C-alpha cells in the first residue's frame, strides 16, 4: 500500500474509510477516464469509478486521488465520504455537488432575456472568495494545486446559497506520483512552463486566470489564442483585457495575480482581503453583468 504525506502526516490505503459495497446504491449518471454517478450510502454522494479495464498505474493513480482528498479538511474543498476499493469497479465516494462544475454553471447561468437576473456581481465575488479560501488552506499547508481553474471547481447547488469548492486534484496527483498538449498552459505562470518551477505563487497566477473565467462568465481564457500563442504572449508581458463590464477593483486583483515575478504576486490571505474589499464596495456590486 502506497504512502501519502500531507501536512507532515503519513497516511496509507489502510487509513481510507472502506464503505461496504452493499451499502452503496447508484442512482444516475453525471458524466475523461472513469464515470461519475449520483449515489446513496440515506447519505447522498457522488461516486467516482475506476474502469475495471485499466493499467496498474491507473490503479495507483486512483488510490492516490482517494488519499489526497481524504486528508484535506476544509469547507471549500470537496469532502471524501469514503471509498469502496475491495469490490470492482472500485469507488471513491465524494460530497455530492449538485450545482456541477463552475465553468458549466457560469456558461449555463449567464443572464439572458429569459434569465435577466440569474446572476449578479455579488454571486461571482462569493464564488471567488470561496475558492480563494480553499486556496489559502492549501497554501498554509504547503500543498500546490497546479491547476486552479473553473473546470476543477464545483458548486453545492445551483441556487443562491451555493458554495464553491475545489473538487479536482488530478494534476497534483500526477505530479505527486500526461503530456505537453494536456498541460493547463493558459493557467500557468512564466516560470512554470519555462523552468518547471512550482510554488504557491504558481496557484496565485492560476487563481488570477480563474477570476477572469468567473467574471467573463465562463469564457475560455485568452480568446482566439492557442496554447503556444498564449505561452509567447504571457512570456512577453502580455495579459488579458478585463472581462466585459468587469469592475476596475476586480480587474486589479487579476493583474496583481499575474505579476511576472512570483515574489511580486499576493499570497491568498491578501487576495481574500482584496476580494472582501470589492464585496463591500457598492459601486462594484451594483455593476450589472452583461446580458447575452
Curated annotation (Swiss-Prot):
Q: Where does ATP bind?
A: 48, 95-97, 168
Query: What does the UniProt entry say about where the protein is found?
Result: Cell membrane
Residues annotated as carrying Phosphotyrosine in the record are 4, 37, 176
Tissue expression as described in the entry: Expressed in brain and CNS. Also expressed in the small intestine and testis, but not in normal lymphoid cells.
Outcome after substituting residue 148 to T: In NBLST3; somatic mutation
Task: Provide the active-site residues from the annotation.
Answer: 147
Resulting phenotype, residue 143 to C? In NBLST3; somatic mutation
As for PTM, the annotation reads: Phosphorylated at tyrosine residues by autocatalysis, which activates kinase activity. In cells not stimulated by a ligand, receptor protein tyrosine phosphatase beta and zeta complex (PTPRB/PTPRZ1) dephosphorylates ALK at the sites in ALK that are undergoing autophosphorylation through autoactivation.
User: What are the Protein kinase domain coordinates in residue numbering?
Assistant: 24-284
> What does this protein do, in the record's words?
Neuronal receptor tyrosine kinase that is essentially and transiently expressed in specific regions of the central and peripheral nervous systems and plays an important role in the genesis and differentiation of the nervous system. Also acts as a key thinness protein involved in the resistance to weight gain: in hypothalamic neurons, controls energy expenditure acting as a negative regulator of white adipose tissue lipolysis and sympathetic tone to fine-tune energy homeostasis.
- Disease entry from the Swiss-Prot or TrEMBL record: A chromosomal aberration involving ALK is found in a form of non-Hodgkin lymphoma. Translocation t(2;5)(p23;q35) with NPM1. The resulting chimeric NPM1-ALK protein homodimerize and the kinase becomes constitutively activated. The constitutively active fusion proteins are responsible for 5-10% of non-Hodgkin lymphomas. A chromosomal aberration involving ALK is associated with inflammatory myofibroblastic tumors (IMTs). Translocation t(2;11)(p23;p15) with CARS; translocation t(2;4)(p23;q21) with SEC31A.
Complex and partners = Homodimer; homodimerizes following heparin- and ligand-binding. Interacts with CBL, IRS1, PIK3R1 and PLCG1. Interacts with FRS2 and SHC1. Interacts with PTN and MDK.
Give the UniProt family note. Answer: Belongs to the protein kinase superfamily. Tyr protein kinase family. Insulin receptor subfamily.
Please quote what the entry notes about the protein's domains.
The EGF-like region drives the cytokine specificity for ALKAL2.
Record-given protein name: ALK tyrosine kinase receptor
Amino acid at each position: 500500500n502506497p504512502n501519502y504525506c500531507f501536512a507532515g502526516k503519513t497516511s496509507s490505503i489502510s487509513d481510507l474509510k472502506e464503505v461496504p459495497r452493499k451499502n452503496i446504491t447508484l442512482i444516475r449518471g453525471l458524466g475523461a477516464f472513469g464515470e461519475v454517478y449520483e449515489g446513496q450510502v440515506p447519505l447522498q454522494v457522488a461516486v467516482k469509478t475506476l474502469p475495471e479495464v485499466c493499467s496498474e498505474q491507473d490503479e495507483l493513480d486512483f488510490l492516490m486521488e482517494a488519499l489526497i482528498i481524504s486528508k484535506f479538511n476544509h469547507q471549500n474543498i470537496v469532502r471524501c465520504i469514503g471509498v469502496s476499493l475491495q469490490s470492482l469497479p472500485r469507488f471513491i465516494l465524494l460530497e455530492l455537488m449538485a450545482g456541477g462544475d463552475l465553468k458549466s454553471f457560469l456558461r449555463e447561468t449567464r443572464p439572458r432575456p429569459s434569465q435577466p437576473s440569474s446572476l449578479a456581481m455579488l454571486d461571482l465575488l462569493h464564488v471567488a472568495r470561496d475558492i480563494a479560501c480553499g486556496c489559502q488552506y492549501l497554501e498554509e499547508n504547503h500543498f500546490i494545486h497546479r491547476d486552479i481553474a473553473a473546470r476543477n471547481c464545483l458548486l453545492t447547488c445551483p441556487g443562491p446559497g451555493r458554495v464553491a469548492k475545489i473538487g479536482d486534484f488530478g494534476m497534483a496527483r500526477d505530479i505527486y506520483r500526461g503530456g505537453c498538449a494536456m498541460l493547463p498552459v493558459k493557467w500557468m505562470p512564466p516560470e512554470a512552463f519555462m523552468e518547471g518551477i512550482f510554488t504557491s505563487k504558481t496557484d496565485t497566477w492560476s487563481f488570477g486566470v480563474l477570476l477572469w473565467e468567473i467574471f467573463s462568465l465562463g469564457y475560455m481564457p485568452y480568446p482566439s489564442k492557442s496554447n503556444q500563442e498564449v505561452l509567447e504572449f504571457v512570456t512577453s508581458g502580455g495579459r488579458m483585457d478585463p472581462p466585459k463590464n468587469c469592475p476596475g477593483p476586480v480587474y486589479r486583483i487579476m493583474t496583481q495575480c499575474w505579476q511576472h515575478q512570483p515574489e511580486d504576486r499576493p499570497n491568498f490571505a491578501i487576495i481574500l482581503e482584496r476580494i472582501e474589499y470589492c464585496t463591500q464596495d457598492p459601486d462594484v456590486i451594483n455593476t450589472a453583468l452583461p446580458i447575452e
